Every structure is written in C-alpha cells, then in structure tokens.
Amino acid sequence: GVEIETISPGDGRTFPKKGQTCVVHYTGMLQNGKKFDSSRDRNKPFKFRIGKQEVIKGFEEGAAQMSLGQRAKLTCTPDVAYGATGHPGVIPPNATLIFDVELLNLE
Amino acid sequence: YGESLCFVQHVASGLWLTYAAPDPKALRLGVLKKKAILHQEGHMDDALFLTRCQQEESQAARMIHSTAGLYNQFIKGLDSFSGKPRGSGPPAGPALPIEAVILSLQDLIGYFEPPSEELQHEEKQSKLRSLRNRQSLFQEEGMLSLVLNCIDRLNVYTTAAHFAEYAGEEAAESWKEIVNLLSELLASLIRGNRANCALFSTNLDWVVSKLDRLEASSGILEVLYCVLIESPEVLNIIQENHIKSIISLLDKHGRNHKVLDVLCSLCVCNGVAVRSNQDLITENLLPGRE
Amino acid sequence: LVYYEGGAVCTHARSLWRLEPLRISWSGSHLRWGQPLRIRHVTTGRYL
Amino acid sequence: MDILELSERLDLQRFHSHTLRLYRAVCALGNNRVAHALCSHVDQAQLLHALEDAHLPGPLRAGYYDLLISIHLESACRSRRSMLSEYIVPLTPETRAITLFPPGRKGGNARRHGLPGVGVTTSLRPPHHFSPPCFVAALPAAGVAEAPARLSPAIPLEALRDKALRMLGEAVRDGGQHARDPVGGSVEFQFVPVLKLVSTLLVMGIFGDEDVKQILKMIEPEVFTEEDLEEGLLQMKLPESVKLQMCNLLEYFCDQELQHRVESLAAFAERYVDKLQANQRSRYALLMRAFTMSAAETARRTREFRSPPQEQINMLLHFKDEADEEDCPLPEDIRQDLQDFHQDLLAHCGIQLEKKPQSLQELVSHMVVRWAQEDYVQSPELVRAMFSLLHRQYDGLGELLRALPRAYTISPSSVEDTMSLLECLGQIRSLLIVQMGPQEENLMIQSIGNIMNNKVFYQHPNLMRALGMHETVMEVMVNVLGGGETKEIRFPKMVTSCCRFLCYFCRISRQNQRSMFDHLSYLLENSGIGLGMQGSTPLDVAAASVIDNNELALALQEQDLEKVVSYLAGCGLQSCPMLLAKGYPDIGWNPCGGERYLDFLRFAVFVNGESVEENANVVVRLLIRKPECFGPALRGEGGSGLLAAIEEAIRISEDPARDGPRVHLGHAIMSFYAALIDLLGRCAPEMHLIQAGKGEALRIRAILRSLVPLDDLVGIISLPLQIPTQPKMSASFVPDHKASMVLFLDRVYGIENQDFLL
Amino acid sequence: TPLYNLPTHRACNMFLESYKAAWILTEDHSFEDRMIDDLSKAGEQEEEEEEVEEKKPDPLHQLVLHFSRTALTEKSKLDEDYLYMAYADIMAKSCHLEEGGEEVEVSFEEKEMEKQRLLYQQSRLHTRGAAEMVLQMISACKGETGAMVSSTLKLGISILNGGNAEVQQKMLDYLKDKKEVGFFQSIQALMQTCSVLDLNAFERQNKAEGLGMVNEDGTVINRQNGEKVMADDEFTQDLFRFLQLLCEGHNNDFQNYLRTQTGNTTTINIIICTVDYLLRLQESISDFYWYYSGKDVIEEQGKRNFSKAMSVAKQVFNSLTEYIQGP
C-alpha cells in the first residue's frame, strides 16, 4: 500500500493519533514527471484533521506510518490515489503519486 | 432607363411572353416562381422597364462564367481518368489545362485581396463594402462547391509526386502548387463576410477531417481560424474528436502560434463562455505536460 | 427555365442579361423600338 | 532555459506568450474549476517573482500580470463592478455622522472637498469569499448536485497590496530619472500592466485610507492634505495605451466622489425627516390643545390628514422652494438649514456662485484639455473614455440626478437578509453571461428559490423595481426561449421557474404590473407552447399582469388581442400532437390548447366586476371570424348544438374505449365549452347603463343571443350528473362549470315570467 | 392616513423624491457655452506650435469626428449611446443662447448685433467639422422614432437658424457628392409615423380621465391625458421645422433637389409626401369637429388638445410655404 523511506532526524516516537490536526509541508511530484503541487512555495502549513476522510488515502496512510520531525518519501498507488480517472485537468489517468512531508504539528 | 414600360416578343411570331400563374396549391403557398410561358395576347400588365447594373458586377459575372467553365473542364478531366489504372504512357488525349488554371488561381487570389489597413478610413470602408459584395456575388451563384469538389478530387492521392499517376508525370510538380493555391483561394473567399462563413459552417467535419496532410497545409487551418472568428454560432457543434484532431495537428506539425490562436478563438464565443469545450481542451492538453 | 422571382434575387448575379444586336458593325448604337436583337445570359453563357 | 534569452527567444516567446493567451482563455469569464487546475501549472511563487522582475522581454510581462488578473481577480472584479451601480445606504449612527463637511477644518466647502475615497463608505455590498487551492483532497464521491465547484483560488492580498504600492513608486521615480532602458523594452510595456493591477485592486476596495492617500500622492502633488520631489505622473509625456488606464483610475475616483455625495445626502435625510416629523407631531398637538373650531381651521386640519403622505411631503417641500411665495405650514428655522445644506451641495459641485485648481473636478478638466491640444489621437476607445470623463464632471447635477432613482435606504435591522438577496443576485448576474447547460440549471433554481422565499422580497417593492431584477429574469428567459425553432425548448424547467417568479412579482404591488406591462406584446408572441406542461407558462404571467389594474386593461392594443385568437383558430384544426405521442388516438379539435387562451381572454374583461366596452367590442368582432373553426357544431354549418356536443362528451366520458387510455377528452370538451360561454356571457354591454338607450349594446346583445339561442341552456342546465356519496372524480364532470352557463342567462337574456317557472 | 407615526426609513425615501422634484430640476446649469468655448478656443498652446503650417484638428473637431466615424459603421440598428445625448444638447443650446437668451422695440444696431454673435457661434460649432455629421445619422436612423432623431434634429435646428447659406452649401454639396440614397427614405419613414387626431384613443382616454379613482395615492402616475393622444408634438414640429430651415432662404437649388433627386437612382419627392401628411391631418381634425358639433360648450381638455393640433398645423403650413416662396 505505502512504502516510505524515512530520514533520521526528529522525535520518531510521537505517532499521529485519531481526530487531531496534522501540519505538513508536502511537495508533490509525479512519477517520471514534474512538480504539480507544493506548500513550501505557497508558504502555508496546510492543516488537516485525520479521521474525517477528506485527504487522499495514500497521504494519510503514509502520515500514519511515521512520527514527529522525520522526513519521508511517500509513494502511492493509482487505486489508493486518484488513478481511476484522475483529478481533472492536472493529474492524468492511472497516475502514481509521490510526496515528501515535513511538519511542526501539534497533537 | 427608369421609365419605359416596354413589351418584348419574337421577331418571327410576334407572340408576347407573359406569366399566367397556373400553378397548384403547393407552389402557390411556397415559392412565387411564375413560369413566363408565352401565349396569345399575353396580359395587360406585361409592361417592363430597365435598370442598368454597375461596372463591378458584370465583370464579376464574366469571371464567374470563365472560372466555372475552366474548373468544370478540370473536374471532367480528373473524373475521366479517376477509376482507371494506367501504365507507362500518357493517360488520354485531352490533357488538363495546368498553366491556365494556375494563372487563374493566382489572379483570383489577387482579386479578392483585402485593402491596406494603412489607408484612410472612409475609402477603406468603401473598399470593404465592395469586397463583401463581391464575395456575396461569387458565393450566391456557387464556387465553394466547385472548389470543394476540386480539392476533394485532388486529395484522393497522398504522395503528391508518385501516386498522382493518372494525371501525368508532367503534373508531378504542379500538384502542390495547385492544392496550396486552392486552399488560399478558399481563404480569400471566406475572409470577412458573415454570410459566407455562416453558409460554410456545415463543412466543419470536412475541414477538420482534411487537417491530416502536408498538402493540406496551414491555408485550411487559417480558414478554420477565420470561420471560428466570424461565425461563432458553429462553436456549439464542436465535439471532443475535433479537439483531439487539432491537438494531433499541433503534435504532428510542431509548435505553431496559429494553432494557439485557433484554440483561443474556439474557447470563447461572442461575449459568452462555453464550459464544455473549455473542460474538454483543459482535460486533453494540459495534464499530459509532454 | 425562366421565372419572375421576387426582390431577393434583385441584387444577385443571377438575373443578368446582355443585349446583343444582330450585326457586328455598330452593335452599341442607340437601340430603337422594334429593333431585332438577342438576349445572352452572361453568367451561364446561354441564350434565351 | 531562463525566461530571458532574447536572441533565441524571438521565435519561442511568440509561442509562449500565445500559450498564455490560451491559459487566460480557458480561464474564461466566470470559471473557477479550470482556474484551480491552472494553479498547478503556475503557482503563487512563480507569479510573484514574475511581478517583481524587471528583465522580461515585455510581452511576457504583460502576459504574466494579465494571467494574475485572469485567474484570481477576474471573478470578484466583474461581480463587484456589476453591484457598484447601486447605492443602498443602511441607517446607522455611523451613517448619520457622514456629511459633505470635511472633518478637520471649518468652512471646508469654500476649501477643498477633503480627498476622494478616503472617507468611510458604509455602503451595502457583499464580501468575496475566496477559497484556497489544493490537490490532495478527495473528490466529491456523490454527484455535482448543482454545487459551486469552487469559489475562486485565493492569494494573500496584504502582500499584493504592499507590493503593488511599491514598484508603482519605483517605476514613477525611475521615469522621473528619465532613463533610456524601460522595463520590458518600452515605456508603455512598463506602465500598462502595473496600472492594470492597481486599477483592479481599487475595485476590490481593499486599500487602506492611508493607501489611497498615498496612491493619490504620486499622480501629482496637487491633491494634498493641509498637514526631484517625485514629479507627477500626469505631467510626464507618455503614450496613448497608458493614457487609457489613467482614464480608468480617474473614473473610479469620480465614482467614489459620487457615492460619498449621495451617502451624505441620505445622512442628511434621516435627521431632517426625524425633526420634521416631530414638528408635524407638535403642530398637530398644538391644534389639538387649542383647536377653536372654525371653517378655516377645519380646512387646514382636514388638509393635513386627509391628503396622503405623497402630497403632504410634496406640498411641504414645494412651499419651501419658492421666491418668497412660500405659504409655509412650517417655521423658517428648518428652511434656513435646508437652504444651507442645498447651497453646500451645489458648492460641492462645480457651481461656485494660477493654474492651481487644488481640486479633482477642475484638475481633470484642465488635464483632458491639455491632452487634446497636442498628439491628435487615433485610438477610438481613448476618445470615448476621455470625453465620457470630461462631461461627467461639470454636469454633477446630471450625474447625481441620474443616480438618485436607484438609491434606496433601509433599516439597520434588515441588513442581514439583504446579504442573502444580494449574493444570490450576484450569482444570477454572473450566470447570465455563460452559455446554458445542465449544471447551472440546477444551480440557478437555488438562487431563484432563496430570493423568491427570502422575506425581504415581500417588502419594499420600490427596491425591487430598482436594480433591473425583473429585466434580468426576463433576460435569462429570452435566451432559453430564443432560437426560433419549435425544438428550441432545451432545458424546459427554467421557463417554469422564471414564470413562477414573475407571476409572484406582479402580485406584490400595482406598479410592478405597470413595469411588466411594457413586455406584454413580446410574451404573447411566444405563447405557442406544448400546451400542457405543468406549472406556470408565459401566457399565464401575461394574464397575471393585467388581472386587477382597471387602466392597463384600457391600454391594451388591438394587435395584442388579434394574435391570441389567431392562435385559437388553429386549435380547432390541429389535433394537439403532444397527446398523440401520449397515446390519445385522434381528435380534430384542441380543447386543451383553447382553454388556456380563453382564460387569458377572460381576464381582459371582468376587471373589478365590470365589463370594459372597448376590449369587449374588439373581442366580439374578432370572435365571429377565427372561432368559425371547432367543427360545424357551433359554426352553424352542422347543427349539433351545445346539448348535442355535451351529450356526446358524456357518451365518451362513460365510455373510455372511444377516447384514449389526468386529461380526458370528454371532460376537456366540457371544460372548453364552459369556458367559452364564460367569456361570451361575461362581455355583455354593461348591466343596464348603456343598454337603456345606446345602440352599440343592442347590436352586441342581438348577435350574442343569435349564436347560442335560448331553449338550449335550459336543456343543458336541466341535465343530470352522477352524484355519489363509489365516488367519481371531478375530472369527468364539474358542477361549477354547470354554473358557468348561468352567467350567460343572468346578463344577456334576463327573465320576465315563464323562464323562472320552468 | 397620518404623515406622523410612519417608519423612519420610509420618510427618507419620500424626502429624496420630493427634494429631487423640488430643488433639483431647476435651471442652475449655466455651463453650456463654456464647453464649446473652452474646447475650441485652445486651438494650440502658447508654447505649442508645429511651425511648419501643418495644422491639426482642435479638441472639438476630434469630438465631432469620433461621432461621424461611429455613424459610418455598417450596422442594422443604432446603439443607445447615452454619451451622445449630452454633447448634442450642449452643442445645440450654445446657438440657442443668442435667439432664446436674448415691451420695448430693439434698436437697429442691437438687432443687427444680435444677428451677429450667432453666425459666429454657428461658425464656432458646425460650419466646419459638423455640417455632414447631423445629416449622416439621419440616414443611419432608417425608421426609428427614438431619441436619436430627436436630439440630432434639435442640433440641426440650432445650426441652420437664420438661413446659414454657408451651411446650406456644405450640406447640399456633401449630399450631392455622395449619392447617398436612403436619407430621403429615412425622412419618408419618419414622416409616415407622425401622430394625428385619433378620436377613439381620445374617447378611451376621456373615460380614463373620468375614472378619477386613486390607487395608493398614485392616480396621476398615468392620468396625464397628453402623452396618450398626440405623444409626438415636439418631434413632429422639429422635423417639419428642419425641412423649413433647409430652404428658408430662397435657394431654388436645394428646393429643386428636394423635389427630385437627379444623380440618385430613386427619387422620393418629399414635397408631395408633406401634402399626404397634411391630408391625413385634415381628415382627422375634420372628424373631431363632427364629434363636438352637437355639443355647444367645448371642454377645457378638448380645447387644449385642439390647440396643440392647431400649432402643429401652423408649422406644417409655414414649412409648406417655403418650398414655393420665391418662384
């Protein structure tokens, strides 16, 4: 489903818990493609609460498998991601998505 | 002129020509055509008077007659050897009038050339009105059907050098010039006038299908550009496959700003948006990114 | 065929006729009543 | 490759700038879904760095600035500009504080007028409600459900405000140095798009009071508070394209001056009418204490009360404005204050009663004249904009007088509901421009539903007559109705919703029907419809306009009446093909289509329980000819009378085999003839006024009695009807439609002795 | 119903209406002359000068040429153009100032001086630049009775007043040069739609006036009785006034052209059409006499209506005279 490749520095113990906000600094990247979305250039943390089921399954799954401070290289499959028809006008059909996240989230 | 109230008959019989209106209900409720079959004594209201025509229309009518005769001879020639394999030799007796047709196409595109924008306003408007009138006079009697038939007959071949055999080896070089000049001549007709493109909007499928060959060069492309500029009512008819054909043209013939202007004109109607073609072109073009 | 059509065709190039008198010499003279002549549809090249 | 190689970029930048044309095109008027998609290809940081840079080729600089406008700022600017031509003023203490007097200097009417736009507006207008962009949110699993898709992509506006103030000053200062390498390769490329941005942000109205004061600074140091040196932008020589944008900026300032003027007028109005009404209370009370009854005192006391508020306010103010022939019922004290206010208003305008105007009004007049001296122009748009600006200044009374009809004040309490009304109206106006489709249909009904059932639409019909909302609803209706072909009925639900709203709008007040009467010729032209769809129709609203007026009925032209009966002629011939597709086999007539037209013809005549002679006369002359159809039964060529046709209809009613498998042909024929005699009986000549002597009544009554002679009504009314306790539907036979026959007998024939006995 | 104890917000809406009708709509403009003077006086700045005899248009000339360029565009129906109403009225009132702005018998010197300061005002306005501007848009207005024709005609009356032989030369030479057939067709279409004495509409309106019932204190919103019966007094008078002032001076060249165009394909012969309008008016007014013949005393409203019709009849008679005054 999700196969992260984490990076060492950070706490590495405080996992996310259900029904709480999760700050991120995600920067999208298409598989053998280009950047399409990012928040570092936009300068906004993009707060979101886990449990309400509003973000994509792969992103929350990758966030579940990590903890505070640690960077990671998230990977997502087309079925988990948009890849049945695709997000219209930006992502093509049958996509495979990549993300990498840093955070200073509260819990 | 103006006040004659004259009558006309044969020199031999002296039998006056007049309408009679013998028609049934069907023509009576429909068109007001009155077949002026002649009979004894005519009718009391057979008086006629004369109105002279200006210089331009008579000249234009004569050019129409000459071009129609030449292009009909051309069509007859092309149809003569269309369905006929032929070996090493001449195709038939009457060869085509290649040089005359080329000079005709050059002079006709020169004739319909628009006026210089640098010229003063009033005379420019007058020349514009004259050009619009001349386009209407040409299009009413025809000359889009002849040009369409000619280019369709020519485009059965694809090589432009080899497979165009039945015309003759002498016509190997002339084919590219003929098709390019014919496309430019069609562009010269369709420019400006609303009525011409309004009539020509039916052939959207024909023109967009024709955009699949180097001989079908950018002349027809800018014809489509003019059609979309001048006849916005056709914009609703457009479907997804036409957009795919246009994008295929952009990929196949390299980068070109003219196609970009074509798509931009295609996007928005006369002061009105169109969400359908907007979403279609946005889906097809952008997210691939290649 | 020939028909007495309405005013829509008045501006068009369909109703054009050429008055060709018989003899070549001085064809463009002042026409008179009862003069023999010929009618020529210039657009089609035909004769009534 | 950087956005920079100008030798190599000569071919490439042509293509790239034209691709930006495509980007702005697909971000068309009133689209946001595509705009959110385009934010990926061009993000915020790329855009902002394009704003700051000053090494671009120049066409790209214009393109990138314009792309910023196209994505984010287009939607809000268009909507707010549409609502900018309204001047609703809520009543508040903050409203009352506003005045023409400048704040911090006595006698400021002699001095300058303050500054334009610095003052608080407190005008009723809605917010924008942007939404931020993202591409990591789950799509809506359910259907569209007429959702808004997106509001618009968001940007931090404070950054843009502080930025846009900056390089304008830098560009003006660099121009003051008078260099020879303008940004983008030309001066006009430098100054056009930056001024385009700041011009749009003025329409946003998101500039501080100090910010607009600052922006007023570098135009020229002339419009300056009392409290190289960055010489004025206007003083510089600069080309025509930039001059057009300067006209746009000055037009915004003139609109702000006008809005401040009318706002202060409303502020004066509240205090003045309050003290005036208190004086009216005290004067009536003084009469009550010491009335001392006499004929003259009764004349004055009666004229105070019996006259309506219209003539009371009109007379009260008419007496005030006079050349000493006042005859004022009120004292001189209030009149002095009103004359001072009027003189202050006229002093604010150009009417006063070296080359240092020290005011906007004189400044721009000298400026446009100075532009007209040198550089004989060639842009037509610049000419129209310039002279439009010039005439507006000196005819301030004309501008004011043109603006006041659409001005309208309201309470403090009802401001919240007006947000629902105005934002729904903005949705309607925004959706007007787009070509029609299924999604916006469902969305459009939501706006119509909320505004129709708001609450505030019930009240204040003068405000509803303002804003052109009835014209707007008509404008959307004509588009779907337009096309000309019979198959131009695509999306046949907006017609029902529009007609329902218009029907309810006519009933609110009489003057609304007067406003709607002007389109009445057009509505009946399209009255030919399917004739049987549920809900309202164009013909129904056309009848609803003139239902209870008693003057609009007189105003009907003969051309209107002949059209509907010309349609009625075809009803007898045609067989109603919609019901042929339904399943009903074949009938020569069209009773269903005829009944609706006859209903509208009914509403012409019985206005307030009377019968207007003129319309009735034209109707009876026309009714002889075109209702010669409906077979030979009533034509007289046959002989099957009304009793014969009704008995035949009853035979079909009990026998469903003859008719096809809501609508029943027998009940339809019953209803059609009952409605027809309802019209014919109703349009008798008066009751007894003109019948006792005038000849027109006798002629009309004689022809009326001939067509439907006596000894046929008595048979039809005497016929039985199935009377169950088992029950039968009313959609087979009706007793009220039996009573429709009685209305003919009461007005036309009368009864002497024996008809009563029978 | 008492004015007091009303809503406080309602009285503001009442107050602005009465104040709009009380102080506003008062003749305090006093700026019509200043526009034409200011625009035309500054032909060039004191420092500004080409110094090669290449004179360029003035501000006013540019303003006129913009409208003339707009009129020449190919179109079916002309736009509303609310801007044009302003400058049309502003231009027309300038020459109106001499004749209208200014018992005792005036001196010969004062009267001749009053004839002067009008040809100069007319020459400031339209002898150069706007002679054919007015004539063009009449041809553009093919058959509409809208405000285009009204405002344009009012300017046309203002410039031609006194006879203005220069202006007649300019107008006639332009119209003869272009062969612009259609202008006289536009005049014919305008003339056919003129109002006459309709007795049926008058009787219906008399019943409406008799129905004096109030409606929310709004009885007089459409109880005018003048806008219903004629509706065209100003426009009809101005139209025939323009035809009078074209040939006020005994030209016998413009009159012949008006009778019958030579170079144009079709001739309208407006002088006969005026007789047709007069004949229609004769039948209408004659029928009105029969309606009031049995009645002894005439109503006040009836005499007022009949006086309005009589004034229009007078203007057509004078305009008819000027076609034949001078042999």
Residue D247 in tokens = 């006209």
Task: List, as ranges, residues 76-105 from E with C-beta within 8 Å of D.
Answer: 83, 86-87, 90
Cβ pair E29:D551 closer than 8 A: no
Determine the Cα–Cα distance for residues E213 and E205; give it in Å rounded to an integer.
14
Q: Which domain holds residue A73?
A: 1-107
Answer yes or no: is E102 a known binding residue.
no
Q: Could you tell me the sign of the dihedral formed by the alpha carbons of D196, D197, D200, D206, in that order?
A: negative
Report CA-CA distances (Å) from E103 to E98, E106, E114, E115: 19, 9, 17, 20
CB contact at 8 A, A28 and A88: no
Separation in Å, CA of B199 to nearest CA in chain A: 35
Residues of chain E contacting residue D243, judged by C-beta atoms under 8 Å apart = none
Contact criterion met (CB below 8 Å) for D249 and D242? no
D-facing residues of E in 180-219 (CB < 8 A) are 204, 207-208, 211, 213-218
Distance from CA of A45 to the nearest CA of B (A): 26
- Contact at CB, E74 and B125, closer than 8 angstroms: yes
By the 8 A CB rule, do D131 and D150 touch? Answer: yes
* Residues B86, B162 contacting (CB under 8 angstroms): no
3-state SS string over chain E? CCCCCCCHHHHHHHHHHHHHHHCCCCCCCCCHHHHHHHHHHCCCCCCCCCCCCCCCCCHHHHHHHHHHHHHCCCCCCCCCCHHHHHHHHHHHHHHHHHHHHCCCCCCHHHHHHHHCCCHHHHHHHCCCCCHHHHHHHHHHCCCCCCHHHHHHHHHHHHHHCCCCHHHHHHHHHHHHHHCCCCHHHHHHHHHHCCCCCCHHHHHHHHHHHHCCCCCCCCHHHCCCCCCCCCCCHHHHHHHHHHHHHHCCCCCCCHHHHHHCCCCCCCCCCHHHHHHHHHHHHHHHHHHHHHHHHCCCCCCHHHHHHHHHHHHHHHHHHHHHHHCCCCC
Contact B207, B224 (CB under 8 A): yes
Distance separating alpha carbons of residues D428 and D447, to the nearest angstrom? 7
Shortest Cα–Cα distance, D219 to chain E (Å): 23
Which residues in chain D are contacts of E62 at CB distance < 8 A? 372, 376-377, 383
> Chains that contact A by 3+ CB pairs under 8 Å?
B, D
Distance from CA of C4 to the nearest CA of B (A): 5
Any long-range contacts for C11-16 (C-beta under 8 Å, 24+ apart)?
A: C12/B136, C12/B137, C12/B140, C12/B141, C13/B57, C13/B60, C13/B61, C13/B64, C13/B137, C13/B140, C13/B141, C13/C43, C14/B140, C14/B141, C14/C43, C16/B53, C16/B57, C16/B58, C16/B61, C16/C41, C16/C42, C16/C43
Asked if residues A16 and A97 have their Cβ atoms less than 8 Å apart, the reply is no
Examine the residue annotation and report whether A100 is marked as an active-site residue of this protein: no
Among A38, A90, A99, beta carbon nearest to D37: A90
Residue E320 corresponds to which amino acid?
L
Question: Which tokens go with A77?
Answer: 């499959």
**DSSP letters for D472-530:** HHHHHHHHHHTTSSTT---STTHHHHHHHHHHHHHTT-HHHHHHHGGGHHHHHHT--S-
CA angle B200, B204, B209 (to 5 degrees): 135
- Shortest distance, CA E72 to any CA of chain B (angstroms): 8
Q: Quote the DSSP letter at residue D745.
A: I
Query: What would the two tokens of residue D376 be?
Result: 């004989």
- Bridge partners, residue A21, by sequence: A49
Q: Which of C2, C31, C33, C48 to mutate to test the interface with B (most CBs of B within 10 A)?
A: C2
Total residues found in chain D within this entry? 758
Task: Please give the Cα distance from E240 to D516 (Å, whole number).
Answer: 35
Check if A79 is active-site: no
End-to-end, the C-alpha distance of chain C in Å comes to 9
Method by which the model was determined: cryo-EM
Q: Which helix (H) or strand (E) holds A49?
A: none
Around Cβ D489, how many Cβ atoms within 10 Å?
14
Tell me the chain A residues in contact with residue B285 when contact means C-beta distances shorter than 8 Å.
Answer: none
| Helix, strand, or coil (residue D409) | strand
**In angstroms, what separates the C-alpha of D67 from chain B's closest C-alpha?**
14
Looking at the DSSP bridge assignments, the partners of residue D87 are D407
Q: Cα(D433)–Cα(A55) distance, rounded to whole angstroms?
A: 34
Q: Kindly state the tokens that stand for B11.
A: 């020199």
Resolution value in angstroms: 4.1
Give the span between the Cα atoms of D494 and D490, in whole angstroms: 10
Nearest 5°: phi and psi at D599? -65, -45
Residues in E touching D277 (Cβ below 8 Å): 3-4, 6, 11
* 3-state per-residue secondary structure call for D6-57: CCCHHHHHHHHHHHHHHHHHHCCCCCCHHHHHHHHHCCHHHHHHHHHCCCCC
Catalytic residue among A7, A46, A48, A56: A56
Alpha-carbon distance of D648 to B194, in angstroms, equals: 58
Which of E1, E21, E30 is opposite residue D308, by nearest beta carbon? E1
CB atoms within 10 A of CB E268: 21
CA distance D38 to A89: 8
In contact, E3 and D277? CB cutoff 8 Å: yes
Contacts of B35 in chain C (CB under 8 A): 1-3
Is C16's CB within 8 Å of B58's CB?
yes
Helix (H, G, I), strand (E, B) or coil at D328: coil
Q: In a 3-state reduction of DSSP, which class is residue D88?
A: strand
* Residue C16 at interface with chain B, using a CB cutoff of 8 Å: yes
Query: What phi, psi does D87 have (nearest 5°)?
Result: -135, 45
Q: Is E248 annotated among the ligand-binding residues? A: yes
Mutation target to probe the E interface, by most E beta carbons within 10 A, among B52, B120, B121 is B121
- SS3 assignment, position D551: coil
D642 alpha carbon, distance to own chain's centre: 48
The pair phi, psi for residue D446, each rounded to 5°, is: -65, -45
Query: Is A99 strand, coil or helix?
Result: strand
Specify the DSSP class assigned to residue C25. Answer: T
Catalytic-labelled residue, pool A37, A48, A50, A98: A37
In angstroms, the CA D373 to CA E58 distance is 7
Whole-number Å distance between alpha carbons of B281 and D629:
56
Q: For chain A, how many structural domains are there in total?
A: 1
Cα separation, B91 vs B84, in Å, equals 9
Residue with tokens 């209809």: D649
Q: Which helix (H) or strand (E) holds A98?
A: strand A97-99
Interhelix angle E131-140/E147-160, nearest 10 degrees: 150
Among B287, B247, D47, B251, smallest CA distance to A33 is for B287
Report angle CA E6, E9, E12 to the nearest 5 degrees: 100
Contacts of E55 by beta carbon, 8 Å cutoff, 6+ apart:
none
Say which residues have a Cβ less than 8 Å from residue D440's Cβ, sequence separation at least 6: D146, D431, D434
Element spanning A35, H or E: none
Pull the structure tokens for residue D392.
């507006």
Give the pairing of strands C18-21 and C37-41: antiparallel
Q: How many CB atoms lie within 10 A of CB D671?
A: 22
Q: Which two tokens stand for residue A57?
A: 């399954």
**Spatial distance between the Cα atoms of E268 and E184, rounded to a whole number of angstroms:** 6
Q: Which residue has the tokens 């302003």?
A: E86
The conformational region for residue E25 under phi > 0 = left, psi -120 to 50 = alpha, else beta, is: left
User: Which residues 6+ apart lie within 8 Å of D588 measured at CB?
Assistant: D572, D573, D575, D631
**Distant-in-sequence, close-in-space partners of B161: CB < 8 Å, separation ≥ 6:** B172, B175
Can you tell me which residue has the tokens 């190919």?
A: E74
From residue B189, alpha-carbon distances to B194, B200, E113 in Å are: 11, 11, 63
Chain D residues in contact with E4 by the CB 8 A cut-off are: 277, 280-281, 284
Q: How many residues are given for chain C?
A: 48
C-beta of residue D80 within 8 angstroms of C-beta of residue D29: no
Distance CA B119, CA B117 (A): 5
β-strands D87-90, D407-410 pairing: parallel
Respond yes or no: is residue A46 known to be catalytic. Answer: no
Catalytic, A26? Answer: yes
Beta bridge mates, C18: C40
- Give me the long-range contacts of E64-70 (CB less than 8 A, separation at least 24): E64/E126, E64/E129, E64/E130, E64/E133, E65/E129, E66/D380, E66/D383, E66/D384, E66/D387, E67/E133, E67/E137, E68/E130, E68/E132, E68/E133, E68/E136, E69/B121, E69/D380, E70/D380
For tokens 């070996």, what's the residue? B87
D551/E208 Cα distance (integer angstroms): 7
Give the H/E segment covering residue D696: helix D695-707
Instruction: Provide the 3-class DSSP secondary structure of residue D228.
Output: coil
Contact residues, chain D, for A87 at CB < 8 Å:
135, 139
Q: Read off the tokens for D43.
A: 């993000």
The tokens for E315 are 């203007």
- Neighbouring chains of B at 3+ CB pairs under 8 Å are A, C, D, E
Q: Does A90 touch chain B (CB under 8 A)?
A: yes
Cβ within 8 Å of residue E125, ≥6 positions away = E36, E91, E94, E95, E158, E159
Q: Give every CB contact of residue D754 below 8 A, 6+ residues apart in sequence.
A: none
Domain CATH for A8: 3.10.50.40
The CA distance from D276 to D282, in Å, is 10
In sequence order, what are the beta bridge partners of D407? D87
Structure tokens at B15: 């039998």
